[PDB]
Amino acid sequence: ANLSLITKLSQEDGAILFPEIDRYSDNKQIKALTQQITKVTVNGTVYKDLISDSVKDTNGWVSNMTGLHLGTKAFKDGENTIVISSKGFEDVTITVTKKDGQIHFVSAKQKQHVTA
Ligand SMILES: [Br-]
Numbered sequence: 083a084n085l086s087l088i089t090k091l092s093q094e095d096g097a098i099l100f101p102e103i104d105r106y107s108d109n110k111q112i113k114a115l116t117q118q119i120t121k122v123t124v125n126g127t128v129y130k131d132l133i134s135d136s137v138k139d140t141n142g143w144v145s146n147m148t149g150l151h152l153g154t155k156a157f158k159d160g161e162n163t164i165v166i167s168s169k170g171f172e173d174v175t176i177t178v179t180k181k182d183g184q185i186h187f188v189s190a191k192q193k194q195h196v197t198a
Pocket residue numbers: 172195
């Protein structure tokens with residue numbers, strides 16, 4: 083149901099970080115997914131690749147050696163839905179909760195096939 087390789091986040095100033103979304107990974111699936119990101123949405127807002135800029139307080143993302151940085155501009159109280167599209171991988175949906183200024187990791191999945 084949940085991804086094994088994306089499990090956590092860090093809080094930054096006006097941003098969060100997914101350290102496991104690593105463009106330098108020896109894990110070829112994580113490396114190819116991260117290198118080949120095509121689109122990031124937060125609560126349906128389209129984010130811009132800021133390349134190497136601070137993402138503080140932006141609708142912006144950066145992939146670098148510390149992971150995937152996301153601005154919190156489009157974040158809301160309660161549930162937040164982050165959708166990462168990539169060339170070779172089904173969309174990844176990360177759910178995070180915001181409460182009293184604090185954001186925590188809830189789930190990371192790709193849409194699943196129903197099995198018995
Ligand atoms: Br599938």
